[PDB]
């Protein structure tokens with residue numbers, strides 16, 4: 001006897017078929033549908049749905065439809081946020097993105113997991129831990145960010161990464177599981193790609 | 201002497217632009233279209249389309265649109281099935297899923313593949329080997345399951361896994377390619393995440 | 401610096417909010433919307449759009465909706481092209497696909513990337529390097545192909561690989577990051593999958 005809602009915040013196992021959760025979900029997923037199916041020319045429309053879908057959205061935010069979430073109202077986005085096609089966020093709990101964050105296509109964030117033992121999840125039980133994307137972070141394509149992960153500022157996450165651990169700031173991380181490939185140093189102020197110098 | 205119908209069943213190479221296959225594909229993608237572009241409030245309709253779309257569906261099935269498949273009628277689902285956003289199932293041949301199966305967002309299932317040799321696929325020839333998912337299986341995000349793969353009951357597939365070989369029951373598997381990581385023991389019956397236990 | 405469209409062609413850092421780039425994108429995303437939302441029965445309309453969406457498309461092209469791209473007009477496709485669901489192509493610059501190329505579902509092609517050093521991207525500045533996919537290439541599901549990569553003729557990219565470097569022709573590459581597994585020999589002329597021969 002503890003409201004599901006309060007079990008989420010406590011990191012306890014819960015289910016979401018009650019206490020107004022389903023109604024919340026239908027509100028968000030309703031806005032999601034008119035965004036996702038809006039005509040590319042309906043820019044103002046899209047512009048308001050964004051402010052509308054997420055609990056928090058800074059200025060100069062852009063999201064290439066389609067976009068997917070469970071609620072929408074648990075996603076708090078910062079300034080100048082760009083997200084490319086198919087950004088999926090399972091926001092059963094807090095998801096926070098800093099400023100000037102760039103998100104490539106087909107990225108997946110999820111504060112939710114299921115107990116490994118199929119007996120702790122007989123009724124699709126879940127747990128939720130907040131994700132936190134720092135400022136000036138860049139996430140490559142097909143990246144997956146798992147429950148309770150924090151990505152430090154100005155860091156980069158390579159395409160295909162499966163982030164399962166916290167990622168410090170100022171690094172470059174990649175792999176399955178995602179691991180720190182390396183620190184970003186002055187050479188990166190000159191070389192922006194493979195063998196290409198900033199001064200051509 | 202053997203139709204393409206019999207070739208698929210036999211595991212032999214084939215092509216699907218005859219024997220009514222194309223027309224079969226159209227019927228399924230038509231219901232698929234209606235399902236994928238349905239309003240979140242069209243609850244009844246969504247439920248009826250599901251029992252329509254797939255060959256078999258057990259009680260309490262839920263698929264979060266959009267869903268992608270080739271025929272849909274080659275897929276058999278057990279009971280209490282929950283698939284999140286963008287489940288993709290290339291079912292040129294039979295796909296069987298058990299009960300209490302949980303599928304995270306952006307998961308691709310595929311019974312189909314193509315000869316490695318470009319000489320064998322001059323006309324895009326393929327082979328199809330059924331996929332079999334046990335009961336109480338949980339599949340992480342961005343996981344891909346290749347042709348003829350069998351996942352043993354109660355097993356867990358970590359996010360981003362690329363499954364090319366059969367997974368035994370009662371295991372936690374992950375990686376690229378997927379490798380059995382450990383056995384699911386009774387220590388999992390208390391712990392569900394890092395160091396979070398369960399009390400009375 | 402110098403004009404934005406030039407920086408592109410020169411592999412220099414650029415932003416795309418001028419020189420008519422946004423409008424160019426709107427026509428693209430417009431034809432894209434018309435394609436993605438078409439009905440499975442509207443085959444003739446789907447074919448006109450294919451020819452209209454991309455710069456060049458050889459005969460026999462088939463693209464299963466939905467398909468995603470930035471401009472569309474920066475894509476050149478050969479002949480007997482086949483792409484399954486959710487092909488995403490960030491064609492900020494040229495993307496060339498040869499003949500008899502088969503693409504599995506959920507593949508992402510991006511000629512664009514961002515300077516890893518945040519100071520070099522304050523205004524989400526990016527670079528773009530063409531992508532060249534040879535003839536008779538087969539790309540598996542959930543593959544990601546990064547900027548300026550060349551996939552040789554007759555090669556195969558396993559499901560889930562993250563292709564960061566060029567792939568030689570006649571090989572089988574897979575992995576994160578993608579690495580050459582072996583060369584396509586003549587045994588591949590008999591065995592097409594796990595242990596199945598052609599005549600026996």
Ligand SMILES: CC(=O)SCCNC(=O)CCNC(=O)[C@H](O)C(C)(C)COP(=O)(O)OP(=O)(O)OC[C@H]1O[C@@H](n2cnc3c(N)ncnc32)[C@H](O)[C@@H]1OP(=O)(O)O
Pocket residue numbers: 083084102103104105140141156157158159160161172174175181194490510512513514516546547562564576577
């Ligand atoms: C926001 C938008 O919608 S547009 C942006 C869309 N862009 C993309 O999706 C492309 C994303 N780019 C990447 O992921 C690139 O791989 C980068 C930027 C992470 C490469 O990291 P960099 O430090 O610049 O590359 P670098 O050459 O030093 O790579 C070093 C090693 O890491 C490996 N590596 C690089 N990227 C990855 C990756 N994603 N996964 C695994 N390994 C990787 C390399 O293969 C290399 O191998 P080696 O050590 O054996 O030599």
Ligand SMILES: CC(=O)SCCNC(=O)CCNC(=O)[C@H](O)C(C)(C)COP(=O)(O)OP(=O)(O)OC[C@H]1O[C@@H](n2cnc3c(N)ncnc32)[C@H](O)[C@@H]1OP(=O)(O)O
Pocket residue numbers: 090110112113114116146162164176177283284285302303304305339340341342356357358359360361372374375381
């Ligand atoms: C179903 C829905 O629609 S909503 C929920 C969707 N959720 C997902 O897709 C999230 C999937 N979660 C995972 O993959 C988790 O990482 C789990 C389930 C595998 C947890 O791993 P566990 O087996 O419990 O063990 P643990 O967390 O200790 O991991 C141990 C090691 O495996 C690694 N690991 C964890 N997950 C993965 C993964 N997906 N791929 C590869 N390695 C992984 C860890 O990094 C760690 O590294 P180490 O050996 O250096 O210590």
Ligand SMILES: CC(=O)SCCNC(=O)CCNC(=O)[C@H](O)C(C)(C)COP(=O)(O)OP(=O)(O)OC[C@H]1O[C@@H](n2cnc3c(N)ncnc32)[C@H](O)[C@@H]1OP(=O)(O)O
Pocket residue numbers: 290310312313314316346347362364376377482484502503504505539540541556557558559560561572574575581593594
């Ligand atoms: C166009 C369409 O719509 S068709 C539908 C799309 N189809 C798919 O997505 C299926 C993709 N198939 C694959 O990825 C398969 O793994 C193939 C075709 C690459 C098989 O590889 P093959 O060339 O036949 O060689 P083989 O199976 O022996 O692989 C050898 C090793 O490579 C590894 N390997 C194979 N495929 C992959 C992969 N995708 N990623 C990583 N490793 C892989 C194997 O695990 C194996 O491990 P080991 O050497 O330690 O034992």
